């Protein structure tokens, strides 16, 4: 939503002017964060951990 404003100083009998609540968005665009690791079968067998 738009910021709050100050009401307007006006004459008598004058039109009340429009300054309506105005809207926008922030767009999220979720980015795929990825991580890989590869290990050989002999490595997996021989390692202590």
């Amino acid at each position: 939503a738009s910021d709050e404003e100050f009401a307007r100083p006006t004459g008598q009998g004058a039109e009340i002017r429009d300054d309506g609540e105005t809207y926008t968005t922030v767009a999220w665009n979720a980015t795929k964060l990825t991580e890989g690791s590869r290990v050989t079968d002999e490595m997996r067998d021989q390692a202590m951990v």
């Binding site: 008598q12 009998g13 004058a14 039109e15 009340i16």
Partner: protein, 49 residues
Amino acid sequence: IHTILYAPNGQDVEIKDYEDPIRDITGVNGRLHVDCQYSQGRSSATVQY
């Protein structure tokens, strides 16, 4: 001599009010429809200077 009074609502003077919320003015309006006709104009004499 006949005074002919027409009103769309009721029989006599119609008063209407309005509130203007854009300008903060109240109005009062009045209306009547009127004619006048002689049924016999030979029933009347004018005095001329």
